[PDB]
Every structure is written in structure tokens, then in C-alpha cells.
Symmetry: none
């Protein structure tokens, strides 16, 4: 087993779930093991925002202050005086992993407890949003707050991006933001051939937690939805993007 | 001086022009010397395409065949049976330097002659588009077909991306494509500190020609536009990306 080999080579725990959406074939390795979801949750948060707003409603401008800025605000730190629309915030969140942009959106939908509620509504009994960003990245082993599983993240991302939890024009906006992610070049994208389109959202959290969730479109045929989640056993561990890239390679061979 | 030194270390000729758009301070070294432009011309070509089409017009699907494929077709080779839209062709050309994509775009705007006319229209009397890809990369010393200069490529890139040859929505498309280029990690990008956003387009051609053009954004300040061009004196010469990285570091210091 090639996933066991990766765990060995990288001294890490892997959580993998992959669904070929045209055949229902699956590739699983610890699919039901919890990990901190880290910023992957930003994608589910935008799915809920899109549920709750018309495309036009995304033009609402949000005002905020330096008080709303947190640890990492690459876009949001530029627009304190002009504000940013909900559409611009969704962009920043998904494409740059802008943590204040996530916090701003979470406030607009009613906060972590509200997000949790809406995830339950679409059938996700696993994913447990509790905190704002970046506090949700502090998860100790055994704890269930702000965790999910590779199977649940896959099932939820499919639900919003590809199934009927959103109407098509809204699915298209989510897919477009995720296709044009800036943060994921060394992860799932690195284990897929050039010319296979990828929409992804990365995450990093404590205990060397390193995650990528994605939709992958082969040149023909239906897409694959994948979660590659990882963690290590020391609290301040470093992660290695190559683990996710190599894991992706394994999945693609097993499905193809 | 430091550019001399790099020419001595890498046995090569360097063309450098850099403009700090905030101060109008400039850094130049052989700035009006001609070089084969190579695939840097891809950025300009998308500039022309964007100008001539609405954003919605980019969704027009182009059907192509194996005969449209040339020596390097990382994206276009995958979708012969489905075709690709003009937008997807622009993504392929800019982010992967897909040669067929550039040719297909060039056909849609009226060919090299018509691209020449449009560049003269934007104020570019230097750049001399004459051929398709890959043949445009074959330039012998002293010839002016398919050549430009560092000053002219900076002037033109700025006009499209930052000034008024395009409306902002189209500027955003071109800039985001160039920010997410996959081919330039070892060139200008490698001479700029991590975290500063960089938009770039690379090229390589005969006589060990190796080019990169870019916009570089300090975390705050107006952007710098930069062209680093290079050639060597044997026809079959190899180039070294490290020449381009090191030249860039020089420009950054010269501007600070």
C-alpha cells in the first residue's frame, strides 16, 4: 500500500476520500478519521453564503475596521477605507485564504453556530464549525470542534458545487473562484496532469495539519471530488506539501 | 556595475528596463537593444484580444484539430474533441505558454500582421510580430522580425495592464492570468521577496534567448513594471534562469 508508504515517508497521518462522480467508484484511506478542517471550511462557508443571497445581493458593501483584521489579511488589509463587497470578500477568502474575509462572511451568515446549522440542513452531520479564523486552526488530538472527515468534506463540497444545494449560476461562481485559487499549486494541482482543470481550497492548522479539498475535471467524463487531509503528532510540526501532491498521484492511479 | 558582472558570470547579453509606476524612477541596461521577444508576446496578444471582445464574447467556442497543434500544447492537446473557448485559450497561452493556444488566438484577432497594427495603435512602434509559434522563436542576430526591446515591452505591458488600453474588468482578467502563471517560478519571481504579488510571462528562443516580463506589487506602493531579456552568441546555446533571477534582485535594490 502506497498510502501507508506516504505516511511512512512523511511521518504523518493521511485522510483520503475520493469519489469519481461518473461511476460512483471511491478511493478511501482513513476516510472517516477526524482532522482540523482549517481553511477548507471557507469553501463550505461561501456555499452557505450563496444559498442565502441572490447573485445581486453579493454586491452589498461591507464596512469594517482594523478591529476586523486578524493574522492574515492579504486583500482585506487594503480596503479598510473603501470597504469590500460580499462578492469581493468571497473572492479574497477562497482565492487568497484571507482570514478576515472569512470572518466577515461568517458574521453575515450568522456566525459559526449558524453555519453549523445550515451544514446539518444539507445533510452534513460530521463537520463541526465552532470558531472564527484563525482560532479554529487550534485543534488538539481527540477534540471534535472545528473538525471534519475526508468523506464529509467531499460529500459537502459535491453538494454545493455539483449537485442541488445551489442553482447552476451560483455553482458557477463557486467553481470559478476555486479554479482560480492562488494557494494550492503544490498540493492537489501538483498530482494531476496539465490540462485537467482543478478547483481547490487549501488548509493549514496545528499539529502540522495540511489539507486540500478539490474538484478535478478530466478532459472528458464526469469530475472527481477529493479530500486529502493530513496531520502529524507534534503540536508545532511543519507540513510538507509534497505529501498531498504524492497522495493525489496515488488516487488518480487507483481511479484511472 | 552589477549588470556587467551578470553578463560576465553567465556569458550572455542582458536587456533591462524597469519602471516604478509610483515615482517614475527607472532602471535601464541596454534598454533599447533588440531581442527575440519569444513567448512574452503572448501577454500582448491577450491584451489585443481583450480589447477587441467583450468579456462575454470570450466565451465563444473555438473548434480546432490536430493540425492546429504544434510543438508544445500542454492544454490544447487535451481538448481537441470538445474545443476550447477564447477565455480558456487565453488562460492556456498565458499560464502554460501553450503554443497552439497562442496561434488560435492570433488567428481570431487576424494574424501577426493584424497584431502588429493593433500594437502600433496602442503606441508601440518597436515590437515586430511576423510569425506564428514556434517559428517566431527562430531569430538570427541582426534580424528584426519577431523582436522587441525591454523599454517597449514594459511600455506596452503597462498600457494594457495598468493604464487605459483596457477597461478595469479586462485588466483584472489579464492580471489574474499573469499572477497565476505556472512557468516563471525560477525567473523574476525568484528575484522578488515572497509575498509580493507578481504577474509575469516568460519566453525562450534561439541563441539561448531567455525572457521574462512582469508587474511587481510592493505590499504597498504603486507597481513596478519590468522586462529582463537575454541572449547568447551560439545558435544552440542553453540559457540559465538564474541570470533572470539575479538581474531582478539588482533592479529591486536599485529601486530601494
Amino acid at each position: 500500500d502506497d498510502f501507508a508508504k506516504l505516511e511512512e515517508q512523511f511521518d504523518a497521518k493521511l485522510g483520503i476520500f475520493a469519489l469519481d462522480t461518473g461511476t460512483n467508484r471511491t478511493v478511501a484511506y482513513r476516510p472517516d478519521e477526524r482532522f482540523a478542517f482549517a481553511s477548507t471550511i471557507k469553501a463550505l462557508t461561501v456555499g452557505v453564503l450563496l444559498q442565502q443571497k441572490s447573485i445581486e445581493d453579493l454586491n452589498q458593501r461591507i464596512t469594517y475596521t482594523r478591529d476586523d483584521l486578524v493574522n492574515y489579511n492579504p486583500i482585506t488589509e487594503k480596503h479598510v477605507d473603501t470597504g469590500m463587497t460580499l462578492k469581493e470578500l468571497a473572492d479574497a477568502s477562497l482565492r487568497y485564504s484571507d482570514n478576515a474575509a472569512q470572518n466577515l462572511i461568517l458574521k453575515q451568515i450568522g456566525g459559526p453556530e449558524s453555519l453549523k446549522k445550515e451544514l446539518r440542513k444539507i445533510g452534513d452531520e460530521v463537520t463541526n464549525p465552532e470558531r472564527f479564523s484563525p482560532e479554529l486552526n487550534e485543534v488538539n488530538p481527540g477534540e471534535t470542534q472545528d473538525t471534519s472527515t475526508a468523506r464529509a468534506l467531499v460529500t459537502s463540497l459535491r453538494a454545493f458545487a455539483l449537485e442541488d444545494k445551489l442553482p447552476s449560476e451560483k455553482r458557477e461562481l463557486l467553481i470559478d473562484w476555486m479554479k482560480r485559487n492562488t494557494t494550492g499549486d503544490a498540493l492537489i494541482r501538483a498530482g494531476v496532469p496539465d490540462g485537467w482543470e482543478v478547483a481547490d481550497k487549501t488548509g493549514a492548522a496545528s499539529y502540522g495539519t495540511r489539507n486540500d479539498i478539490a474538484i478535478i475535471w478530466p478532459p472528458k467524463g464526469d469530475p472527481v471530488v477529493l479530500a486529502v487531509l493530513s496531520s502529524r503528532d507534534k503540536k508545532d510540526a511543519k507540513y510538507d506539501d509534497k505529501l498531498i501532491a504524492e497522495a493525489t498521484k496515488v488516487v488518480m492511479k487507483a481511479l484511472n
